[PDB]
């Protein structure tokens, strides 16, 4: 039963062995039943950690490669190693994507859950876009944008910016506009509109929601300055 | 060629993912060549990190099991056993490589590989159970003894290898043998011997030696406490 896998996931988390946590929640996804917000958060953390490690690795190898473009044969070997990383990163992204598309997104009944999973789909497609080039990049970026816009249009109707999942969506959506759509002015406009829409009710949040909201809004504010700089 | 393998390992190290680093250094060593201090250091970094992540996990899981009052405890035990089998497999993978290629082949090299053998047997001892816990430790003390002999005869007390032997052997004495007096004796001996050359250390090894001595002083405080 998935109830047991939940404990297994927490165990894999505390050990900093996210691969097993992901393998556990992956099978929790294949149960077809609707995940509770706790399980949803666990699955988010799991794949976010697993992809992040490869993202960091890829950026490091890529940088080393571009730093040594004059090194001939060893540059060639470094490139082979880099591609050998990229296929892993892509496989992890496609794994989580297919899981979301075939089990979580089809089943999500709650507006909140719909937003969370659509957002996650967008995020993982963005991580693929960061890796891809040409028409591959175009197709991945288009579907990522499609997912974010769908989540944005849903959350705009169903949730105030006083809820952290809406802010999380706005932050990541703005990052996509800036980093992937190459639209920094659009990114800043989106981020600022979300931040000031939040400011309008920032003192109405609950004890936990205000902490969560502030934790996200401070990132919104900092990204705004980082991009305007 | 060994040079390209070494380069790929270096690349994996820079990428900060070590499993592929270890898997490349393994085949570098299967050529039967004497690993120079750079590739030797790379190999140590590789297997040390590959085992260390599992070690942390095992400690954490063992703590959770102890925190249990059931399927909960059964599951924790099973995950612990999975981690231990992984860690055991990697340690065996290293010990056989040393026994088949590195330990069969300078005094410094000899001592480095023997110490490595001891430390890998010690990491097994941290996960071991049953009467074979003694056999694991036995093989560890055997290697550490050969290391201590070669180092006392051919390594100045300024040598970082000679100090690492005593530090780990003492950790073995306190954590595996619960003998703080045995640990503190060897540790203090090494510490004062290094101090007898406190100004004789090399420009880089000053920091190396003092860091080892700082750890020695701290664990000395721990075992005396």
């Amino acid at each position: 039963d998935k109830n047991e896998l939940v404990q297994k996931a927490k165990l894999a988390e505390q050990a900093e062995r996210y691969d097993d946590m992901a393998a556990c929640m992956k099978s929790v996804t294949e149960q077809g039943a609707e995940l509770s917000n706790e399980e949803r958060n666990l699955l988010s953390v799991a794949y976010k950690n697993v992809v992040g490690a490869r993202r960091s690795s890829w950026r490091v190898v890529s940088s080393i490669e571009q730093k040594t473009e004059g090194a001939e044969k060893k540059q060639q070997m470094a490139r082979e190693y880099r591609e050998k990383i990229e296929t892993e990163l892509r496989d992890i992204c496609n794994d989580v994507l297919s899981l979301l598309e075939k089990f979580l997104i089809p089943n999500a009944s709650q507006a909140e859950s719909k937003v969370f999973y659509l957002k996650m789909k967008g995020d993982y497609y963005r991580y693929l876009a960061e890796v891809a080039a040409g028409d591959d990049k175009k197709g991945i970026v288009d579907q990522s944008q499609q997912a974010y816009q769908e989540a944005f249009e849903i959350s705009k109707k169903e949730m105030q910016p006083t809820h952290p999942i809406r802010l999380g969506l706005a932050l990541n959506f703005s990052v996509f506009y800036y980093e992937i759509l190459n639209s920094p002015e659009k990114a800043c406009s989106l981020a600022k509109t979300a931040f000031d829409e939040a400011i309008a009710e920032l003192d109405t949040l609950s004890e936990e929601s205000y902490k969560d909201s502030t934790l996200i809004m401070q990132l919104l504010r900092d990204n705004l300055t980082l991009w305007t700089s | 060629d060994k040079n390209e393998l070494v380069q790929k390992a270096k690349l994996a190290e820079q990428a900060e993912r070590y499993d592929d680093m270890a898997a490349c250094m393994k085949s570098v060593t299967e050529q039967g060549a004497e690993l120079s201090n750079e590739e030797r250091n790379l190999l140590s970094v590789a297997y040390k990190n590959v085992v260390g992540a599992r070690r942390s996990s095992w400690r954490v899981v063992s703590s959770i099991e102890q925190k249990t009052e059931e399927k909960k405890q059964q599951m924790a035990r099973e995950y612990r056993e999975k981690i231990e089998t992984e860690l055991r497999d990697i340690c065996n993978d290293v010990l056989s490589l040393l026994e088949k290629f590195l330990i069969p082949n300078q005094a410094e090299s000899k001592v480095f590989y023997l110490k490595m053998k001891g430390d890998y047997y010690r990491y097994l001892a941290e996960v071991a159970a049953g009467d074979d816990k003694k056999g694991i430790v036995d093989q560890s003390q055997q290697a550490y003894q050969e290391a201590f002999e070669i180092s006392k005869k051919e390594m100045q007390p300024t040598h970082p290898i000679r100090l690492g032997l005593a530090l780990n052997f003492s950790v073995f004495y306190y954590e595996i043998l619960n003998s703080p007096e045995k640990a503190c004796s060897l540790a203090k001996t090494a510490f004062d011997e290094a101090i007898a050359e406190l100004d004789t250390l090399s420009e880089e090894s000053y920091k190396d030696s003092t860091l080892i001595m700082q750890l020695l002083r701290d664990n000395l405080t721990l075992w005396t406490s």
Partner: peptide
């Protein structure tokens, strides 16, 4: 516990 031996730019959306 004991001690043992030494060795030899965008603002992305943060997690919960």
């Amino acid at each position: 516990r004991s001690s043992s031996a030494p060795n030899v730019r965008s603002a992305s959306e943060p997690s919960l």
